């Protein structure tokens, strides 16, 4: 059903980005905040707010160029049907280093560019292309 | 310190011996899906205190019979 909520999060981002929507809403969680705040610090989105404490509702502000999609495509890599893990030197790049790869480690959620100074590996979340 | 396995008991009918099953998660060499692999060992049970479904701690010993090579340490949880 909603068994991969991160893949449900990537579905709601990719649709409203392409369909010229100004802002989207989604059910919040701890892990969804730990991904959207990284995308806010990497220039892909604008802002996020939390609403509700018994039903946590996350909101995302979209971002455009001249009415053109900033996030052109995003790819869920690991999934509950097949888990993907890499080491500190087998971290894949997106568009040969242009896009970022969201990898959550013990030192929080960071990119593979940020995992060079950290020297860790773990679960690949999404290819932000 | 020494080599030590942990698991649960699937059979206890025979005297002075129990059957402890060990499960492990294996990356498949072709696809990568983590698969539960069952390892069924025969463990020497002194005084026959182990029942069904007991999470138990076992260690390594010499071969005591045709099929047995493992011995008992202590029971973590009994008869819940």
């Amino acid at each position: 059903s909603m068994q991969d909520p991160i893949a449900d999060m990537l579905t709601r981002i990719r649709n409203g980005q392409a369909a010229n929507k100004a802002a989207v809403t989604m059910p919040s969680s701890k892990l969804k905040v730990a991904i959207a705040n990284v995308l806010k610090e990497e220039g892909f989105i604008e802002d996020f707010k939390v609403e509700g404490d018994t039903k946590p509702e996350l909101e995302l502000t979209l971002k455009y160029f001249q009415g053109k999609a900033v996030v052109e495509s995003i790819q869920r890599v690991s999934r509950p049907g097949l888990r993907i893990y890499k080491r500190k030197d087998e971290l894949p790049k997106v568009m040969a280093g242009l896009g970022i790869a969201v990898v959550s480690t013990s030192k929080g959620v960071m990119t593979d560019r940020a995992a060079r100074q950290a020297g860790l590996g773990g679960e690949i979340i999404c290819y932000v292309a | 310190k020494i080599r030590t396995l942990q698991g649960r008991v699937v059979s206890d009918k025979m005297e002075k011996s129990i059957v402890v099953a060990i499960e492990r998660f294996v990356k498949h060499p072709i696809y990568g899906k983590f698969i539960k692999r069952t390892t069924k060992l025969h463990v020497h049970d002194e005084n026959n205190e182990c029942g069904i479904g007991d999470v138990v701690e076992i260690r390594e010993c010499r071969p005591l019979s045709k099929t047995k090579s493992w011995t008992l340490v202590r029971v973590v949880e009994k008869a819940v």
Binding site: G81, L82 | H28, I30, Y31, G32, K33, I35
Partner: peptide
Amino acid sequence: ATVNQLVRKPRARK
């Protein structure tokens, strides 16, 4: 198509 289907039986090489 499913990876979990190939756990039961792999792709049958002719």
